[PDB]
Design a protein around this motif. Structure first.
Motif, mmCIF file in Angstrom:
data_model
loop_
_atom_site.group_PDB
_atom_site.id
_atom_site.type_symbol
_atom_site.label_atom_id
_atom_site.label_comp_id
_atom_site.label_asym_id
_atom_site.label_seq_id
_atom_site.Cartn_x
_atom_site.Cartn_y
_atom_site.Cartn_z
ATOM 1 N N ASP A 117 3.550 25.615 1.046
ATOM 2 C CA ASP A 117 4.384 24.882 1.999
ATOM 3 C C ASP A 117 5.499 24.134 1.270
ATOM 4 O OD1 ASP A 117 4.646 23.862 4.921
ATOM 5 O OD2 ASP A 117 4.574 22.007 3.751
ATOM 6 N N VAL A 118 6.374 24.889 0.615
ATOM 7 C CA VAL A 118 7.490 24.285 -0.133
ATOM 8 C C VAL A 118 8.644 24.166 0.855
ATOM 9 N N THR A 119 8.561 23.143 1.703
ATOM 10 C CA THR A 119 9.564 22.823 2.712
ATOM 11 C C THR A 119 9.111 21.571 3.445
ATOM 12 N N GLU A 120 10.066 20.915 4.102
ATOM 13 C CA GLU A 120 9.800 19.848 5.066
ATOM 14 C C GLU A 120 8.937 18.738 4.458
ATOM 15 N N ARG A 121 9.520 18.066 3.462
ATOM 16 C CA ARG A 121 8.865 16.893 2.895
ATOM 17 C C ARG A 121 8.631 15.827 3.957
ATOM 18 N N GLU A 122 9.540 15.719 4.928
ATOM 19 C CA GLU A 122 9.342 14.781 6.027
ATOM 20 C C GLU A 122 8.138 15.161 6.877
ATOM 21 N N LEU A 123 7.833 16.459 6.978
ATOM 22 C CA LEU A 123 6.668 16.882 7.748
ATOM 23 C C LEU A 123 5.388 16.299 7.167
ATOM 24 N N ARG A 124 5.244 16.346 5.842
ATOM 25 C CA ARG A 124 4.144 15.637 5.200
ATOM 26 C C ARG A 124 4.291 14.131 5.379
ATOM 27 N N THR A 125 5.522 13.622 5.288
ATOM 28 C CA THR A 125 5.760 12.194 5.462
ATOM 29 C C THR A 125 5.496 11.726 6.888
ATOM 30 N N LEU A 126 5.462 12.640 7.857
ATOM 31 C CA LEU A 126 5.264 12.290 9.255
ATOM 32 C C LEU A 126 3.803 12.371 9.684
ATOM 33 N N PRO A 174 -2.478 -0.588 8.409
ATOM 34 C CA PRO A 174 -2.704 -2.039 8.333
ATOM 35 C C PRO A 174 -1.501 -2.847 7.867
ATOM 36 C CG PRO A 174 -3.855 -0.883 6.567
ATOM 37 C CD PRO A 174 -3.375 0.164 7.517
ATOM 38 N N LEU A 175 -1.024 -2.625 6.640
ATOM 39 C CA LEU A 175 0.088 -3.416 6.123
ATOM 40 C C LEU A 175 1.310 -2.580 5.763
ATOM 41 C CD1 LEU A 175 -1.355 -6.322 3.933
ATOM 42 C CD2 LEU A 175 0.471 -6.468 5.638
ATOM 43 N N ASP A 176 1.183 -1.634 4.837
ATOM 44 C CA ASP A 176 2.341 -0.958 4.256
ATOM 45 C C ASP A 176 2.054 0.523 4.038
ATOM 46 N N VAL A 177 1.465 1.177 5.036
ATOM 47 C CA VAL A 177 1.092 2.579 4.891
ATOM 48 C C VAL A 177 2.353 3.431 4.915
ATOM 49 N N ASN A 178 2.832 3.817 3.734
ATOM 50 C CA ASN A 178 4.052 4.599 3.603
ATOM 51 C C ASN A 178 3.869 5.630 2.502
ATOM 52 N N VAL A 179 4.449 6.805 2.692
ATOM 53 C CA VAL A 179 4.326 7.899 1.735
ATOM 54 C C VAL A 179 5.599 7.987 0.908
ATOM 55 N N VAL A 180 5.431 8.101 -0.408
ATOM 56 C CA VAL A 180 6.546 8.240 -1.337
ATOM 57 C C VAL A 180 6.416 9.581 -2.041
ATOM 58 N N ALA A 181 5.887 10.571 -1.326
ATOM 59 C CA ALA A 181 5.530 11.846 -1.933
ATOM 60 C C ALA A 181 6.742 12.523 -2.555
ATOM 61 C CB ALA A 181 4.898 12.764 -0.887
ATOM 62 N N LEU A 182 6.507 13.208 -3.668
ATOM 63 C CA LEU A 182 7.535 13.900 -4.431
ATOM 64 C C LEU A 182 7.237 15.398 -4.434
ATOM 65 N N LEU A 183 7.989 16.135 -5.244
ATOM 66 C CA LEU A 183 7.824 17.573 -5.372
ATOM 67 C C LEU A 183 7.390 17.917 -6.788
ATOM 68 C CD1 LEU A 183 8.341 20.350 -3.817
ATOM 69 C CD2 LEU A 183 10.434 20.436 -5.192
ATOM 70 N N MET A 184 6.602 18.979 -6.908
ATOM 71 C CA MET A 184 6.105 19.452 -8.190
ATOM 72 C C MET A 184 6.870 20.690 -8.635
ATOM 73 N N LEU A 200 0.819 -1.204 0.000
ATOM 74 C CA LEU A 200 0.000 0.000 0.000
ATOM 75 C C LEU A 200 0.856 1.257 0.000
ATOM 76 C CD1 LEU A 200 -2.960 -0.830 2.388
ATOM 77 C CD2 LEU A 200 -2.652 -1.299 -0.046
ATOM 78 N N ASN A 201 1.684 1.413 -1.027
ATOM 79 C CA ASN A 201 2.559 2.570 -1.150
ATOM 80 C C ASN A 201 1.937 3.561 -2.124
ATOM 81 O OD1 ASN A 201 5.292 4.116 -1.905
ATOM 82 N ND2 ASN A 201 5.609 2.928 -0.029
ATOM 83 N N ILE A 202 1.761 4.801 -1.669
ATOM 84 C CA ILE A 202 1.113 5.852 -2.439
ATOM 85 C C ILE A 202 2.040 7.058 -2.490
ATOM 86 C CG2 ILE A 202 -1.021 5.013 -1.399
ATOM 87 C CD1 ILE A 202 -1.288 7.401 0.166
ATOM 88 N N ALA A 203 1.710 7.994 -3.375
ATOM 89 C CA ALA A 203 2.519 9.184 -3.580
ATOM 90 C C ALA A 203 1.633 10.419 -3.611
ATOM 91 C CB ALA A 203 3.329 9.097 -4.876
ATOM 92 N N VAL A 204 2.219 11.552 -3.231
ATOM 93 C CA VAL A 204 1.526 12.832 -3.195
ATOM 94 C C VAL A 204 2.412 13.874 -3.856
ATOM 95 C CG1 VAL A 204 0.977 14.754 -1.671
ATOM 96 C CG2 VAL A 204 -0.045 12.508 -1.269
ATOM 97 N N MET A 205 1.842 14.637 -4.781
ATOM 98 C CA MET A 205 2.546 15.719 -5.451
ATOM 99 C C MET A 205 2.055 17.041 -4.878
ATOM 100 S SD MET A 205 3.868 15.406 -9.223
ATOM 101 C CE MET A 205 5.179 16.416 -9.907
ATOM 102 N N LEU A 206 2.980 17.842 -4.363
ATOM 103 C CA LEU A 206 2.624 19.050 -3.639
ATOM 104 C C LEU A 206 2.429 20.218 -4.602
#
Lengths: 129, 60, 129
Positions: free
Chosen positions: C12-21, C31-41, C1-7
């Motif tokens: 808020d162009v800073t702190e990618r970990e803040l969104r990742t946290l 449940p199983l694999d809730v992880n964010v692979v978000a990138l930058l736009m 269950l790996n998903i991505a988010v494009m900002l």
């Protein structure tokens, strides 16, 4: 909004897994060769409607938009800025003005000289509320 | 002549390609050649759906 | 269950970990694999958008993507549906250009906006009337 969306996706995935233990595999390669329909059933499309998240009741319709949008009606102020008046939560307007304030249409406009704030008192045969 | 427009196209079979070219030539045999000179380029079909958008963007 | 988010790269162009946290101790249960692979736009073009999405898709088995574009190019929304047209990966947009409604989508794809339809706006108008 981001947190709500991630929660929606996680809940949908959990419901799909609980329905039956068959995880959906991602596509091989968009850049690759041609593609053919091979999904035994709609993976998570039916698992999108009728989903709740800590009070928020986002329930995307068959057309494809939210059924409870957060709509707020705005009005231009007297300083050329957008104000905010009245939300829309379940169905109610919940307006934030019992009586509409007569707003200055322009700095160069005729004065409001036809509005009279009449008054009365509650009697038996004169006024009945 | 210094102005040169660049009408593209996307046809089906290579043979129709040739036809297209000849067609645009008629559009210059009758109308003039000073502020014009339509120039014709084209491409042929692909089956990979997204390859269509990628090719049309990059080429045309 | 790996998903991505494009900002949006603007507010808020800073702190990618803040969104990742998101939901650090417990977001929704994980449940199983809730992880964010978000990138930058950045400045979005159909070539660049298709390239980035196709490249990411041939990555860590991506799942439903949340889109957060900041600019208003209008037609971008349509383009998004096209991707969901030919790769069975659900996708939803929340903010910005992918917010205005598009109406009838292809019944063989999944893409849900988060804006206001024409009918809802008209209904709220008549209610305020």
């Amino acid at each position: 909004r981001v947190r709500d969306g991630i929660g929606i996706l996680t809940t949908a995935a959990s419901s799909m897994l609980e329905k039956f233990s068959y995880i959906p595999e991602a596509k091989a390669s968009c850049y690759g060769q041609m593609e053919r329909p091979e999904v035994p059933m709609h993976t998570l499309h039916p698992f999108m409607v009728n989903v709740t998240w800590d009070g928020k009741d986002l329930s995307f319709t068959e057309e494809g938009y939210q059924v409870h949008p957060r709509l707020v009606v705005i009005v231009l102020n007297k300083d050329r800025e957008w104000e905010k008046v009245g939300k829309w939560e379940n169905h109610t307007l919940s307006l934030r003005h019992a009586v509409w304030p007569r707003y200055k249409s322009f700095s160069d406009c005729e004065p409001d000289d036809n509005h009279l704030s009449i008054v009365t008192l509650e009697e038996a045969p004169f006024v009945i509320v | 002549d210094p102005k040169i427009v660049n009408i593209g196209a996307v046809l089906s079979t290579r043979k129709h390609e040739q036809m297209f070219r000849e067609a645009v030539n008629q559009a210059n045999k009758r109308h003039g050649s000073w502020k014009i000179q339509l120039n014709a380029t084209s491409v042929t079909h692909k089956p990979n759906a997204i390859q269509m958008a990628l090719s049309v963007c990059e080429d045309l | 269950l790996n998903i991505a988010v494009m900002l949006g790269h603007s507010h808020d162009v800073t702190e990618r970990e803040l969104r990742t946290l998101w939901g650090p101790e417990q977001a929704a249960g994980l449940p199983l694999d809730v992880n964010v692979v978000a990138l930058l736009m950045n400045r979005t073009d159909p070539k660049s958008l298709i390239t980035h999405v196709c490249d990411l898709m041939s990555g860590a088995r991506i799942h439903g993507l949340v889109f957060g574009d900041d600019t208003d190019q209008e037609a971008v929304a349509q383009m998004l549906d096209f991707i969901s047209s030919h790769t069975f990966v659900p996708i939803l947009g929340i903010h910005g250009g992918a917010s205005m409604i598009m109406a009838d989508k292809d019944p063989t794809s999944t893409f849900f906006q988060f804006g206001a339809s024409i009918q809802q706006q008209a209904t709220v108008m008549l209610k305020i009337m």
